[PDB]
Specification:
This is Nucleosome-remodeling factor subunit BPTF. With 119 residues, this protein is mainly α. It contains 6 helices and no strands.
Length: 119
């Protein structure tokens, strides 16, 4: 990561752009498994093997409450969604496939956000 991502505090303007990126992810056709916390009936072993769960609704609450101070911290929560999914599920499963596509889409949107802060 560049120095601005790591060290520049998130301003009010920055937070309007975080809100946009998050709504883009929530609207993507492959986002369904990640909108809310994993339900233990879809997986009774999930919370014994993933010790730091994350989901888009928890990120939304943190954005609304101004939890994040630096962009790196926001990026780290989003990446945990995709890393948890690729660790838990086999590489041929549809859950794994959703993580591949959504992460690539997140990177496209993140690069747009970074450009907009610096110019």
């Amino acid at each position: 990561e560049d120095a601005m991502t790591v060290l520049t505090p998130l301003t009010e303007k920055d937070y309007e752009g975080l809100k946009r990126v998050l709504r883009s992810l929530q609207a993507h056709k492959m986002a369904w498994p990640f909108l809310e916390p994993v339900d233990p009936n879809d997986a009774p072993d999930y919370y014994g093997v993933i010790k730091e769960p994350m989901d888009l609704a928890t990120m939304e609450e943190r954005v609304q409450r101004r939890y994040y101070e630096k962009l790196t911290e926001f990026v780290a929560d989003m990446t945990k969604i995709f890393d948890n999914c690729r660790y838990y599920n086999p590489s041929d499963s549809p859950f794994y496939q959703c993580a591949e596509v959504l992460e690539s889409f997140f990177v496209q949107k993140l690069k747009g956000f970074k450009a907009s802060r610096s110019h």
